[PDB]
Amino acid sequence: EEAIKQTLRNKFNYNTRECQTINPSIRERGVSTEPPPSDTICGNITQWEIFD
Amino acid sequence: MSEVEDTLNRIKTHKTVLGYLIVNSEGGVVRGAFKDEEESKNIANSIPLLTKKARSVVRDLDPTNDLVFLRIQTKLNEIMVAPDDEFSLIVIQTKG
């Protein structure tokens, strides 16, 4: 009765497919964002320097 | 010439005058004829800033009208400055 079961499972009564999904490879990256440099400016304005 | 270099010699020799000092437009000493150097170095740095600050005073009120001659008067001393674009002449005269 054991052989008859093994005899019941065929190649054309139990095919055996393989299937995987396409997985992207993991990757570890660094990104440092530093804003534009900020420069001190000193200006004086007097009535003469405008007129000059 | 005898005429600038003589007149400058004449005002120095003149009685009750401590010394005449020429300042360059860039706050530099061309000629400095005082007794002690500390006073001459101090006058070379300090006074031409007062004259530039005092030029901006007369200029604000009327920007056509430029400084021709500045005279301060202290308790013991007088300080007289004749500014020009190329050079500035400074003197210290004790009050009579």
Give structural attributes.
part of a larger assembly, 2 chains, A: 52 residues, mainly alpha, 2 helices, 23% helix, B: 96 residues, alpha+beta, five-stranded antiparallel β-sheet, 36% helix
Descriptive overview:
This is part of a larger assembly, with chains A (52 residues) and B (96 residues). With 52 residues, chain A is an all-alpha fold. Chain A has two helices and no strands. The longest helix of chain A is centred in the N-terminal third of the chain and has 7 residues, at 2-8. The N and C termini of chain A lie far apart (116 Å). Chain B starts with a helix and ends with a strand. Chain B has 96 residues and is α+β, with helices and mostly antiparallel strands. Classes of the chains: A mainly alpha (52), B alpha+beta (96).
Q: Helix/strand-derived class of chain B?
A: alpha+beta
Helix content of chain B: 25-40%
Biggest β-sheet description of chain B: 5 strands, antiparallel
What is the helix fraction of residues of chain A, given as a range?
Answer: 10-25%
Beginning-to-end CA distance, first to last residue of chain B: 32 Å
Largest interface, counted with CB-CB under 8 A? A-B, 5 and 4 residues
Order of helices and strands of chain A: HH
- Rg over CA atoms of chain A: 40 Å
Number of helices of chain B: 2
Report the sheet-strand fraction of chain B. 25-35%
Distance from N terminus to C terminus of chain A (CA atoms, Å) equals 116 Å
List the helices and strands and how they pair.
The structure is cut from a larger assembly and holds chains A (52 residues) and B (96 residues).
Chain A: H1 2-8, H2 47-51
Chain B: H1 4-13, E1 19-24, E2 28-32, H2 37-61, E3 70-73, E4 77-83, E5 87-94
Concise structural overview:
It is classed as motor protein. The structure is cut from a larger assembly and holds chains A (52 residues) and B (96 residues). Chain A is mainly alpha-helical.
